[PDB]
């Protein structure tokens, strides 16, 4: 539900992992303490894949995908591409995308239903995102930022957005995304809210330095929260 | 259209604060956490003469010792703190001992940390005092005294 | 192992050969040697240089 | 958790010693002179500080 | 005489020599050298060498792939060189009268002798050096058209590039392909020795399998690997 | 505070005026030292792609000027060798400014960012639009 | 008010409910118990004076149902325990003391450090 | 007076004198330690260096950043014809 862990000593998880409702991706250079946080609470319901994208460990920022599809940038080698075709099931579809804006995580903010992309993206990509992911694509910016990936975490229930955000811009976004939106901070006051955490329906993993009032705001908008083992035997 | 009074809760207080460009974390949940000193050392050196009993200003001078209201003035220029963020708040010294060659001073800074946060903190510095000669008053041992 | 083509003219670039150039608008240019890498800086048009493959494709050689 | 019968077994090797004032060596608690040569076999001993 | 060596004679070396006629050098003179044996029971070492008089010794019997070896040869020479490029000392400023590529102070007053430790111009190069820890990648045989081939490449070629190695010629023999530079220039007689100690750490025990061997022309800015596919790129020419 | 990075060629000595990549108000950064550099007689310490440097603003907003603050190199014009084989180099030098913990004050970075800088710093990879 | 729960961070387990909490709220503030005293080897020689902290950084609760195998199996006079899924140092049991960081004393009690555990309301959400 | 700026030494002192070698064939100073339980083989070999060429291999080194990645690397090819034995020579041990 509301787990916290960290990669090597870095609190931010959304750089290093990509969580959807049907699969999960993790970087390869990890300890056993980071991989056990996912594998214990996901179990064998969704496949957890140790992978790299373009020879890097920043696969949460280079990829973008949801329940139906996964997009990889141009510099992904065909060894890393043919590897992901085997470990992920046949229901997902993977297609390489020719971009000038290579980092697909910071560009595309998407879920199962509605996607927000970078405003400088071209018409050739927007026809491909609606083909592979099967999602209607809307070009829209959070109030002062053009990167919608790092500054807007999105799910099927709700969404956490950038903290320095005006109210009437959230209300125009909420009519567009059709989910309730809360502005807040994560990881003891980091304004980057898309990369500070990952999220889907059953799980939402954040950093270890996330304080106690910040974890309450995250689980409430995403509505992941809902016991006979406790009791007094004196 | 739901839960859209959203907030900015301050970190680890619970209190909702201004959602705009402002401070960060409650102004008192930031007051315990930030350290505005961060560069001021905990140690410096003062040279004096054992035959003159007269303190040395670092360039060439020899301002004498009253340990009050004029010795305090020379001693904060050596404090290595910079004029960057204090401008001053208040300064006093501790009594500890006459013959031990260490002088303790404590001082408050009243600096700035964030874009609009003035904040005052305090700490104490211990100066090891090194003895050497006054060349003006080591001259008297050479019989070339008058000039 | 991938063999990339020269951005300037036509040449095959085996691994560990020539330079690479990323222009300030994030476009990647590959060069087989310093010949086509120095003629790129002179703003020369490779459709008018005779020894390129881009020329011999145009005039049907 | 330390079982203080075992602590008195351990304190004989670590705590119950003596220290020379001049050369700072670790000496047995009933000793009268330091066994080293660099301090000149002095007789200025002290008990090692307890905790 | 061999029974004299069986009774006495703690260690046994074996005089070998190279075959220079199977080599594109212009020299006709063979090189002679000693090699010590490290078998057992020196009455058995001499019975090994007794049976191998006027018999060839291959390369693959001695060395195997993924093995750490050393390289011993005589360095490339350069003749009489100056004190800056010989030791790496600092150049003097521009304003110096009578020279700036020198060393300023040879020494103090006392001792009134030039010390043995100061930098001074002389012979540079043509020294004997022992370099250690070079890892063997490939031990190729002579009677094979697939020296340059790899399981990931699958093209029939030798490791001799297009137009041969510069200043040397044709490798149509057995060869050893080892990682990184070797002291001594091309054409130089080079000894390869086993490692003196057993190595463990991580880098000795690693096994390698190649992806590709570069066989383009070393005589400058070569862009084709084999002349069979040069003709497919450029097509029909005039000649 | 800096993780492991493979050695690339040193291309920015002390005194180099490099561009400023982000939109934090500055226009150029003046490198005065490099975190984690060495020591040698008369050797200038030099920066590379992905190093943390101390840098001052010479042109930009008047709030930012006349003080020293750490910064991170994101582009470089001197060519370096990657392990896969290609020698690459950008068009001009660039630097973003950050706190000594490594978090970035900027909101977004214009232009491309070197790949070995993106893997070394997590917050740079969040703000990066184009990674090589 | 409403009922609350103290869920473990990184284990996500309700360690303790409300109907607990021997909270002991006021300290003493005087010079013998509100201050931390460090003695010496002989003759009640006091070398250090420390001021108590603001808020009590433990939780003093009942011995609960999940604590039963650790308290029966190899029962001792002092020790610690863990979350049932992560095996981290969550809170220790002591039959001696360990007042609060802020100080009183307690009882032989089960202290639970407020670091690496947090307190949620068991009722509905806050709805700001 | 002292040196006023400490700086490490230029050159290496264990490689003196820099004089020309006695011959183009450098001598093997020391052979590896014998182990008489093992069978008989040679301990060194002779060859002629030819040139250099480039290689590509998949690096297998756990805990590195380039794990299972192609690396270009420089190798030398030493021409190594088969070597034929013409004689043996045995050494006795003295106090000298």
Curated annotation (Swiss-Prot), chain B:
Localization (cell): Cytoplasm; Nucleus, Nucleoplasm
Family: Belongs to the NMD3 family.
Subunit and partners: Associates with the 60S ribosomal subunit.
Protein task: Acts as an adapter for the XPO1/CRM1-mediated export of the 60S ribosomal subunit. Unlikely to play a significant role in nonsense-mediated mRNA decay (NMD).
Note in the entry: Present with 11900 molecules/cell in log phase SD medium.
Protein name per UniProt: 60S ribosomal export protein NMD3
Organism lineage string: Eukaryota, Fungi, Dikarya, Ascomycota, Saccharomycotina
Residues of the whole record sequence present: 10 to 156 of 518
Swiss-Prot record, chain E:
GO molecular function: RNA binding; structural constituent of ribosome
Family: Belongs to the universal ribosomal protein uL3 family.
Maturation and modification: Methylation at His-97 by HPM1 is required for proper 60S subunit assembly and promotes translational elongation fidelity.
This protein's GO CC annotations: cytoplasm; cytosol; cytosolic large ribosomal subunit
Pros-methylhistidine modification, residue list: 97
PTM sites of type Phosphoserine: 10, 151
Subunit structure: Component of the large ribosomal subunit (LSU). Mature yeast ribosomes consist of a small (40S) and a large (60S) subunit. The 40S small subunit contains 1 molecule of ribosomal RNA (18S rRNA) and 33 different proteins (encoded by 57 genes). The large 60S subunit contains 3 rRNA molecules (25S, 5.8S and 5S rRNA) and 46 different proteins (encoded by 81 genes). uL3 forms together with ES39L one of the contact sites for the signal recognition particle that targets ribosomes to the endoplasmic reticulum membrane.
Compartments it resides in: Cytoplasm
Deletion consequences: A mutant confers resistance to trichodermin, a trichotecene toxin produced by plant-pathogenic fungi.
Domain of life assignment: Eukaryota
Note: Present with 450 molecules/cell in log phase SD medium.
Keywords of this entry: Cytoplasm, Isopeptide bond, Methylation, Phosphoprotein, Ribonucleoprotein, Ribosomal protein, Ubl conjugation
Example of a GO biological process term: ribosomal large subunit assembly
Name the record gives this protein: Large ribosomal subunit protein uL3
Swiss-Prot record, chain F:
Pfam families: Ribosomal_L14 (PF00238)
GO-annotated cellular components: cytosol; cytosolic large ribosomal subunit
Post-translational modification: Methylated by RKM1 at 2 different sites, but it is unclear which are the 2 methylated residues among Lys-35, Lys-101 and/or Lys-105.
Molecular-function annotations in GO: large ribosomal subunit rRNA binding; structural constituent of ribosome
Role according to the record: Component of the ribosome, a large ribonucleoprotein complex responsible for the synthesis of proteins in the cell. The small ribosomal subunit (SSU) binds messenger RNAs (mRNAs) and translates the encoded message by selecting cognate aminoacyl-transfer RNA (tRNA) molecules. The large subunit (LSU) contains the ribosomal catalytic site termed the peptidyl transferase center (PTC), which catalyzes the formation of peptide bonds, thereby polymerizing the amino acids delivered by tRNAs into a polypeptide chain.
Additional remark text: There are 2 genes for uL14 in yeast.
Description of how the protein assembles with itself and partners: Component of the large ribosomal subunit (LSU). Mature yeast ribosomes consist of a small (40S) and a large (60S) subunit. The 40S small subunit contains 1 molecule of ribosomal RNA (18S rRNA) and 33 different proteins (encoded by 57 genes). The large 60S subunit contains 3 rRNA molecules (25S, 5.8S and 5S rRNA) and 46 different proteins (encoded by 81 genes).
Name of the featured protein: Large ribosomal subunit protein uL14A
UniProtKB/Swiss-Prot annotation, chain G:
Reported induction: By nitrogen starvation.
Source domain of life: Eukaryota
Name of the gene: YVH1
Protein's recorded name: Tyrosine-protein phosphatase YVH1
Function: May be directly involved in signal transduction and/or cell cycle regulation. It is necessary for maintaining growth rate or spore germination. Could show both activity toward tyrosine-protein phosphate as well as with serine-protein phosphate.
Section covered of the full-length record: 225 to 352 of 364
UniProt record similarity statement: Belongs to the protein-tyrosine phosphatase family. Non-receptor class dual specificity subfamily.
The organism of origin for this protein: Saccharomyces cerevisiae (strain ATCC 204508 / S288c)
Remarks, miscellaneous: Present with 7570 molecules/cell in log phase SD medium.
Organism ancestry: Eukaryota, Fungi, Dikarya, Ascomycota, Saccharomycotina
